[PDB]
């Protein structure tokens, strides 16, 4: 079955959310697109990006280095489409702003706008965790910006509950 997402809560007509590890979701669902929470040089050193790269047994990092050699780094708010490897048909590498490193939070809208080139995506909550954005604000920008069908995997039950309660106010 194609894009067999299970156990998500529908927030709006095109945004769904689950308390889940994006890596485990990608292995089970094998979505058409999985979103990576990338940086501009596609160095998948830890967090979500490191976990997705490790699940490809480093094939994602080798492919990423070859893309950067030929094309140069991405811009903050930008993206590129590369292979999904064993996780998906394609991986959409999206660079959200890292507010802990001084990048502008307004670029989070540009980051989510990349999702609209793909009909169905499995994605993390951009710029959350160690990128420093307020995760409730990231969900609001997602809901207001994405018009295609997005399935958000948030690997923390405490944050999942706060996000759903924030949305349903
Ligand atoms: C908010 C937080 C709960 C969320 N975390 C996540 N959300 C969804 N799926 C996830 N899988 C993992 C994971 C991590 N490590 C291992 N590992 C196997 C072993 O080698 C370590 N496996 C899976 C974490 C994760 C989140 C969302 C966005 C961002 C971050 C974190 S970040 O990575 O801090 C910076 C980039 C933006």
Curated annotation (Swiss-Prot):
Ranges for domain Macro: 2-169
Intracellular or extracellular location(s): Host endoplasmic reticulum membrane
Taxonomic superkingdom: Viruses
Membrane topology: Multi-pass membrane protein
Catalytic activity reported: Thiol-dependent hydrolysis of ester, thioester, amide, peptide and isopeptide bonds formed by the C-terminal Gly of ubiquitin (a 76-residue protein attached to proteins as an intracellular targeting signal)
Regulation of protein activity: Inhibited in vitro by GRL-0617.
Protein task: Responsible for the cleavages located at the N-terminus of the replicase polyprotein. Participates together with nsp4 in the assembly of virally-induced cytoplasmic double-membrane vesicles necessary for viral replication. Antagonizes innate immune induction of type I interferon by blocking the phosphorylation, dimerization and subsequent nuclear translocation of host IRF3. Also prevents host NF-kappa-B signaling. In addition, PL-PRO possesses a deubiquitinating/deISGylating activity and processes both 'Lys-48'- and 'Lys-63'-linked polyubiquitin chains from cellular substrates.
Subunit structure: May form homohexamers. Interacts with N protein.
Name of this chain's protein: Papain-like protease nsp3
Source organism per UniProt: Severe acute respiratory syndrome coronavirus 2
């Amino acid at each position: 079955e194609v894009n067999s997402f299970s156990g998500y809560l529908k927030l709006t007509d095109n945004v769904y959310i689950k308390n889940a590890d994006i890596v485990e979701e990608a292995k089970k669902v094998k979505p058409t697109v999985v979103v990576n929470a990338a940086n501009v040089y596609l160095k998948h050193g830890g967090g979500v990006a490191g976990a997705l790269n490790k699940a490809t047994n480093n094939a994602m990092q080798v492919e990423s280095d070859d893309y950067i050699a030929t094309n140069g780094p991405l811009k903050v708010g930008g993206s590129c489409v590369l292979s999904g490897h064993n996780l998906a048909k394609h991986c959409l590498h999206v660079v959200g702003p890292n507010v802990n490193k001084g990048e502008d939070i307004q670029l989070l809208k540009s980051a989510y706008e990349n999702f609209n080139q793909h009909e169905v995506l499995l994605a993390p909550l951009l710029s959350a965790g160690i990128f420093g954005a307020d995760p409730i604000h990231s969900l609001r920008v997602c809901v207001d910006t994405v018009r295609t069908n997005v399935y958000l995997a948030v690997f923390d039950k405490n944050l999942y509950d706060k996000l759903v309660s924030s949305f349903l106010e």
